[PDB]
Amino acid sequence: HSHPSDMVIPDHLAELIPELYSFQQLVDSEKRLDHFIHLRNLHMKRMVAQW
Amino acid sequence: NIPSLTSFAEENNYQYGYTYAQQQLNKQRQDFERVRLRPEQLSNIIHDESDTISFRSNLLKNFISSNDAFNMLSLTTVPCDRIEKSRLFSEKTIRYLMQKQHEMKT
Amino acid sequence: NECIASTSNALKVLSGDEGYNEDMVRRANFYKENEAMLRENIEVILSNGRM
Amino acid sequence: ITNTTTRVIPQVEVGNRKHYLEDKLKVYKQAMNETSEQLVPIRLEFDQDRDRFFLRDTLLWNKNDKLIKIEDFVDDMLRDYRFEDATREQHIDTICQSIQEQIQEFQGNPYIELNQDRLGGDDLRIRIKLDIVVGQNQLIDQFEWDISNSDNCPEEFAESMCQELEL
Amino acid sequence: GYDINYISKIGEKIDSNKPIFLFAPELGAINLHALSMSLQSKNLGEINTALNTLLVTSADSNLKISLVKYPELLDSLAILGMNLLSNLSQNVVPYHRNTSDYYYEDQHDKMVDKIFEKVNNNSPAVKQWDLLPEPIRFLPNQFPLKIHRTPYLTSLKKIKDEIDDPFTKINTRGAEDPKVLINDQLSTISMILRNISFSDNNSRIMSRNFYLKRFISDLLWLVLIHPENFTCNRKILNFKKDLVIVLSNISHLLEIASSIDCLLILILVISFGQPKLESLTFNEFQLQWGKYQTFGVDILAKLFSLEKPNLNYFKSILLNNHKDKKLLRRLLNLYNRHNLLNDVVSFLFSAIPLQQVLSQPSLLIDQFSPVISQSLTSILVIVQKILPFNFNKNLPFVWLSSEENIGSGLLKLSEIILNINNSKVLLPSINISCVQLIKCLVEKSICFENCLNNDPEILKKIASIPNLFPTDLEIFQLFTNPSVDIQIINQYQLLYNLKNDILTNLE
Amino acid sequence: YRNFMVNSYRLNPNEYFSVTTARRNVSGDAAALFRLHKFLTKWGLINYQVDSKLLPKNIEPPLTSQYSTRHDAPRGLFPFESYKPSVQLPDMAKLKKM
Amino acid sequence: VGIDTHTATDIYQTLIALNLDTTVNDCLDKLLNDECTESTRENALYDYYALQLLPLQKAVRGHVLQFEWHQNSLLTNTHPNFLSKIRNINVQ
Amino acid sequence: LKYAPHLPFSKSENPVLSTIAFLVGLVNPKTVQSMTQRAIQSAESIKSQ
Amino acid sequence: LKYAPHLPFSKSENPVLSTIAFLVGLVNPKTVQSMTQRAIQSAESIKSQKEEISDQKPIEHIKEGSEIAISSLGYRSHIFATNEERQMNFLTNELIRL
């Protein structure tokens, strides 16, 4: 049951606990890291196929 | 098919009353826009999370979650000086922050 | 008072019962503040012949 | 009848006529720009020769009325006269064109209403004669009528005469 | 004191077998004229029993409700939804008023009757009113303070945190509150109107219905600018969830009436999807969640197809009859220059699942070819016919180099689509759309730099995109295979002629 | 005009009260009389029972009938309750005192 | 401790029936004995008339309220998930 | 007793909650809020020391 | 409270008073002396408090005792709220480490 709803700590907890922003922009900092791996993989599928 | 924009006009189509080219174009129009606009009569009728949400199961879970949390409040006869505080860190979060602070000088 | 009024109401819905509050509609000031809808409903039931 | 096998019946009709569906915007576009009326006397005569129907009905009609399509009113009238559904080779178009011609010739109430209106009018009294047949009675009467007065109401005098005679 | 798991287990069966309303097989001969005249009766029971018997039939998918046989039912629905939107923003209670509800119950003699008030003790004016009230704008209560741009997922979390609340009022019933009665009439109106619009004749009758267009432009204001009157937070999501469905089936013939409606359409379509915390301001929507954002990229694909009023209103909104000039200039700077254009283009670059179809090979593109095709058509329309001066920031440059590298994604997608059909109808259009989009983005970046002239070192930064601009070897491959098209290799060879003209002008 | 049309239909409800007889019997333009007659017949009220039919016979299942109601039936609605008398001897003393 | 709500409700029904029957028999005796005045004999005769047809009035007050509740049928107050009709993106 | 046919209270299950349900009608909420906020501020004055 | 059952004339169980005593027997009696002026605070302050609580009705003692009991319940609820906030901070640190 992959619920997309409960990946968000929207307002009521982040205002009370300020570390959750430091959590949340952590996760976003991961989400552009793995994508950088993804554009890496499509790079490495390219150049070998180039050669 | 993919009939026209002229076939969608009100002149070539019927109205509340009270030729051959029109009756040829309205065949393709009703044969195109009834295989396009027809609803799905099968599964994947869930569409999202907030349509198959159940009011009865959530109401039952909230009835249990209010009752036991109120029995946690009143019936627990531990005095306020005797309620021992919980740890703000774990046995693993206290190891990782000893490790990373050791490795922070690189 | 919100913990009690949303516990008995939480039992009425889960049991399956419905309707008005029995102790509210038993008095006479209910039918004096709702004087508008009763003159509609009495004429509707009487004219259809169910009263 | 509702106790059936659950069909969808759009507008089960009365008197073999679909219900008249209004516009409700042209009604307000006309009823607010509603200066005058200008009733039109309309005469319909047809014989068994050169026509098949007879249709000797006479009616008034508002000239400024742009709401009702005239062919729809004529098609309702022919259904009211119990003509069968072959009523286009005994055309509704002939009656519709006659009524379309008779409202085009109507030049309106002239400058006695258009430009000036002298209170009391002029001395123009005309000799109105009438000859009406209803059932087996025939009303024959003449009087005088000021054509130069704007506040002369024909309907308020017709109701007055049929009041006295019990018509 | 009870064992309420067993009580609820029995009460579920009790609620299932309870006689609430009629089912589909026991409705009998549904008469549309009776429903359409009962909706104008301004009763309460005659309205509700018409609405429920319309909701059961319209959701049945075996009983057709055609408006060719009766086109005045839809006007009754839309005028009822208009008049319920009117007295919800003013908090007036209908259906049980204590007013009388009746109007005036009861020549040359009017001067005689004037002096008859003299010798007994011894000309009325005109009226003016309209059929429908003012829309919902131009009301003294309704002035915009905050455009409620809540996203999809935060709305789902707000719903799940309102349902799972101990002191919840989501089931306070209908007869206990009149405001929830108005809201549950409006939700029935919206479910009916989204159920009717799945027919070939209703979709063109609902398209040419001034009442329905005014009701859509009336609700879309209330659900976005002042949603404080709707009781629950699930009704506000459900109005957006069927307004987009009813606008997905209509929009191929819709002519947008006013510019405020053309802005609220954009904000409603934008409100599906997830933003970030310039660059592309929309994280990619992965379609393991819900296909509701794919309906918006068809509304924007079909409403851009008219250069009449549609594209003129979209142009004047994206780039920039006497009170809405003040309303539009209030709504545009309440939306926090050119944030709207880059938000729409970044959202349209979302719902093209580049990461998902390029992570794992033919099934996902065969499933998502229409949404990809219409999204590329919408982006091509925005690039070619809107972007060509009051800009102050290079938008195609910050789309081409926004650290996600969507141009390389489109080029790899064109490679993938070119390597299935030659080794399933829309794919020759999608290839040419991808290549022409990359070409127009590069050319408009260079043209925007020539117009602005503030960043001179961009010819390096355009040519330093790691997987743009396909090499001469794959174009040598494309000029040999007979299974390729002519326009595909034509677009590829002019992309390569653009690549050579980059390097010549580089030094 | 409205009272004339409604009074004239209800003398013989089996007859379709046409526009032409209403036009021939009250003085006015044909457009407004036609619009008023079509509005009146739109809402029932005139020409509602021109061709009436008879419902044949109803083979009634149990509980779908007049006087098909029992005291043993559940009051889902009808919110007034019938309550169980608690006969307990201290509660008997409490009822005698109160 | 302090929990019995239920026996309280039942003996409340009992005490309400007791006081109602006390007033009914008071007006019945005051109308039946003519040693009481007519201003509490015929007054209590019509009190007894009001004490005769009261639960039939409550029966119509229940059925009319039940039909008023039936007027509140909207089919979106009930099941709030009524899934009406959707269709995803077609090739058409 | 205002919620007559649905009473979810048990002497064994919630002895305290039923007596509190009977007791909340008599008291004034303002003095209750004042006394509990005075208790909170007195606990903070003790804990700060 | 009139409609509550009891054991008549014998077997005295006191649900109101034992509820009040159970709720006040959890809440640190020095801050209970800080909570109300009515409670006994010292051996020199018995006579003046006994004089000032005089000339009160039997309903007043019920009212004051139930006020003290509900305020002690609110104070205990505040302590449980702060402990749950500490628990949420612990879960936040666990999330960050993960």
Short mmCIF file of N, CA, C and O in Angstrom, two decimals, chain G residues 7-54:
data_model
loop_
_atom_site.label_atom_id
_atom_site.label_comp_id
_atom_site.label_asym_id
_atom_site.label_seq_id
_atom_site.Cartn_x
_atom_site.Cartn_y
_atom_site.Cartn_z
N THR G 7 -28.62 3.14 34.71
CA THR G 7 -29.67 3.03 35.72
C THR G 7 -30.30 4.39 36.02
O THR G 7 -31.50 4.47 36.31
N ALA G 8 -29.50 5.45 35.92
CA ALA G 8 -30.02 6.81 36.06
C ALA G 8 -31.03 7.13 34.96
O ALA G 8 -32.09 7.71 35.25
N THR G 9 -30.73 6.74 33.72
CA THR G 9 -31.67 6.97 32.62
C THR G 9 -32.96 6.17 32.81
O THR G 9 -34.06 6.68 32.57
N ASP G 10 -32.83 4.91 33.26
CA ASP G 10 -34.02 4.07 33.43
C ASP G 10 -34.92 4.57 34.56
O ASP G 10 -36.14 4.68 34.39
N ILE G 11 -34.33 4.92 35.71
CA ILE G 11 -35.16 5.46 36.78
C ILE G 11 -35.62 6.88 36.47
O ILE G 11 -36.61 7.34 37.05
N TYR G 12 -34.96 7.58 35.54
CA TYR G 12 -35.48 8.86 35.09
C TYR G 12 -36.74 8.68 34.25
O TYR G 12 -37.69 9.45 34.39
N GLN G 13 -36.75 7.66 33.38
CA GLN G 13 -37.98 7.28 32.68
C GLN G 13 -39.09 6.93 33.67
O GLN G 13 -40.25 7.36 33.50
N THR G 14 -38.74 6.19 34.72
CA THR G 14 -39.72 5.79 35.74
C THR G 14 -40.29 7.00 36.48
O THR G 14 -41.51 7.11 36.66
N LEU G 15 -39.42 7.93 36.90
CA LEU G 15 -39.86 9.10 37.65
C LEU G 15 -40.66 10.06 36.78
O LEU G 15 -41.60 10.70 37.27
N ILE G 16 -40.32 10.17 35.49
CA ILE G 16 -41.09 10.99 34.57
C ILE G 16 -42.49 10.41 34.39
O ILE G 16 -43.49 11.15 34.41
N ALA G 17 -42.58 9.08 34.25
CA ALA G 17 -43.89 8.43 34.18
C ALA G 17 -44.68 8.63 35.47
O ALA G 17 -45.90 8.83 35.43
N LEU G 18 -43.99 8.63 36.62
CA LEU G 18 -44.64 8.83 37.91
C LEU G 18 -45.24 10.23 38.03
O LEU G 18 -46.40 10.39 38.41
N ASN G 19 -44.45 11.26 37.70
CA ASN G 19 -44.94 12.63 37.82
C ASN G 19 -46.02 12.94 36.79
O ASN G 19 -46.99 13.67 37.10
N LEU G 20 -45.90 12.39 35.58
CA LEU G 20 -46.93 12.56 34.56
C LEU G 20 -48.24 11.91 35.00
O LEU G 20 -49.31 12.52 34.87
N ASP G 21 -48.17 10.69 35.55
CA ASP G 21 -49.38 10.03 36.03
C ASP G 21 -49.97 10.74 37.24
O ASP G 21 -51.19 10.75 37.41
N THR G 22 -49.12 11.36 38.07
CA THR G 22 -49.61 12.16 39.20
C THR G 22 -50.42 13.36 38.72
O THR G 22 -51.53 13.60 39.22
N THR G 23 -49.92 14.08 37.72
CA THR G 23 -50.67 15.23 37.19
C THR G 23 -51.92 14.79 36.43
O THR G 23 -52.96 15.46 36.52
N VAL G 24 -51.85 13.66 35.72
CA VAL G 24 -53.01 13.13 34.99
C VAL G 24 -54.12 12.75 35.96
O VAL G 24 -55.28 13.13 35.78
N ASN G 25 -53.77 12.03 37.03
CA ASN G 25 -54.77 11.62 38.01
C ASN G 25 -55.25 12.79 38.85
O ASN G 25 -56.40 12.78 39.32
N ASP G 26 -54.41 13.82 39.04
CA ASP G 26 -54.86 15.03 39.71
C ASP G 26 -55.93 15.74 38.90
O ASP G 26 -57.00 16.06 39.42
N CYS G 27 -55.68 15.95 37.60
CA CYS G 27 -56.69 16.58 36.76
C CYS G 27 -57.90 15.68 36.55
O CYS G 27 -59.03 16.17 36.44
N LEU G 28 -57.70 14.36 36.56
CA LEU G 28 -58.81 13.42 36.43
C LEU G 28 -59.71 13.47 37.66
O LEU G 28 -60.94 13.44 37.53
N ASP G 29 -59.12 13.52 38.85
CA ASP G 29 -59.93 13.62 40.06
C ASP G 29 -60.58 14.99 40.16
O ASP G 29 -61.74 15.09 40.58
N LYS G 30 -59.87 16.04 39.77
CA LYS G 30 -60.42 17.39 39.85
C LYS G 30 -61.52 17.60 38.82
O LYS G 30 -62.39 18.45 39.01
N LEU G 31 -61.51 16.83 37.74
CA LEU G 31 -62.64 16.85 36.83
C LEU G 31 -63.72 15.86 37.23
O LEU G 31 -64.89 16.09 36.93
N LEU G 32 -63.37 14.75 37.86
CA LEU G 32 -64.36 13.73 38.17
C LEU G 32 -65.11 14.09 39.43
O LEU G 32 -66.33 13.92 39.51
N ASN G 33 -64.40 14.56 40.45
CA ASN G 33 -65.10 15.14 41.58
C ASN G 33 -65.59 16.52 41.16
O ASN G 33 -64.87 17.30 40.54
N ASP G 34 -66.87 16.76 41.41
CA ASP G 34 -67.46 18.06 41.21
C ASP G 34 -67.45 18.87 42.49
O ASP G 34 -67.98 19.99 42.52
N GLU G 35 -66.86 18.32 43.55
CA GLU G 35 -66.44 19.09 44.70
C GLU G 35 -65.30 20.02 44.36
O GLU G 35 -65.10 21.03 45.06
N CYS G 36 -64.53 19.70 43.32
CA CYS G 36 -63.63 20.66 42.73
C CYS G 36 -64.39 21.60 41.81
O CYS G 36 -65.45 21.27 41.28
N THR G 37 -63.82 22.79 41.62
CA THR G 37 -64.45 23.83 40.82
C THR G 37 -64.42 23.46 39.35
O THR G 37 -63.59 22.68 38.91
N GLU G 38 -65.34 24.06 38.58
CA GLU G 38 -65.38 23.81 37.14
C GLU G 38 -64.18 24.41 36.44
O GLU G 38 -63.75 23.91 35.39
N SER G 39 -63.59 25.46 37.02
CA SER G 39 -62.34 26.05 36.56
C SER G 39 -61.13 25.20 36.88
O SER G 39 -60.00 25.63 36.60
N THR G 40 -61.32 24.05 37.56
CA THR G 40 -60.41 22.92 37.47
C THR G 40 -61.20 21.62 37.37
O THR G 40 -60.67 20.57 37.74
N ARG G 41 -62.48 21.66 37.00
CA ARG G 41 -63.14 20.47 36.48
C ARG G 41 -63.18 20.51 34.96
O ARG G 41 -62.57 19.66 34.32
N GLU G 42 -63.86 21.50 34.38
CA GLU G 42 -63.88 21.59 32.93
C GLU G 42 -62.54 22.03 32.40
O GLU G 42 -62.13 21.60 31.31
N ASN G 43 -61.81 22.85 33.17
CA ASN G 43 -60.43 23.11 32.84
C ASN G 43 -59.62 21.83 32.87
O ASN G 43 -58.92 21.53 31.92
N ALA G 44 -59.80 21.03 33.92
CA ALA G 44 -59.12 19.74 33.95
C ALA G 44 -59.78 18.69 33.07
O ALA G 44 -59.11 17.73 32.71
N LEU G 45 -61.05 18.87 32.68
CA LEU G 45 -61.62 18.01 31.64
C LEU G 45 -60.90 18.24 30.32
O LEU G 45 -60.59 17.28 29.61
N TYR G 46 -60.57 19.48 30.00
CA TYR G 46 -59.84 19.70 28.77
C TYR G 46 -58.33 19.60 28.94
O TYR G 46 -57.62 19.44 27.94
N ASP G 47 -57.82 19.67 30.18
CA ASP G 47 -56.48 19.19 30.45
C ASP G 47 -56.39 17.71 30.15
O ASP G 47 -55.45 17.26 29.49
N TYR G 48 -57.39 16.95 30.60
CA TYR G 48 -57.46 15.53 30.33
C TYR G 48 -57.65 15.26 28.85
O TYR G 48 -57.19 14.24 28.34
N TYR G 49 -58.34 16.16 28.15
CA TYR G 49 -58.39 16.09 26.69
C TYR G 49 -57.00 16.30 26.09
O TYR G 49 -56.63 15.62 25.13
N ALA G 50 -56.23 17.23 26.65
CA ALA G 50 -54.84 17.37 26.24
C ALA G 50 -53.99 16.23 26.78
O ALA G 50 -52.99 15.86 26.16
N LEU G 51 -54.38 15.65 27.92
CA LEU G 51 -53.72 14.46 28.42
C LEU G 51 -54.28 13.17 27.83
O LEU G 51 -53.90 12.09 28.29
N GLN G 52 -55.17 13.26 26.83
CA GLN G 52 -55.66 12.07 26.13
C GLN G 52 -55.01 11.85 24.77
O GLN G 52 -54.73 10.70 24.42
N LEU G 53 -54.76 12.90 24.00
CA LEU G 53 -54.33 12.77 22.61
C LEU G 53 -52.89 13.22 22.40
O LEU G 53 -52.50 13.56 21.28
N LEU G 54 -52.08 13.24 23.46
CA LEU G 54 -50.69 13.68 23.38
C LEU G 54 -49.74 12.71 22.66
O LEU G 54 -48.94 13.17 21.83
#
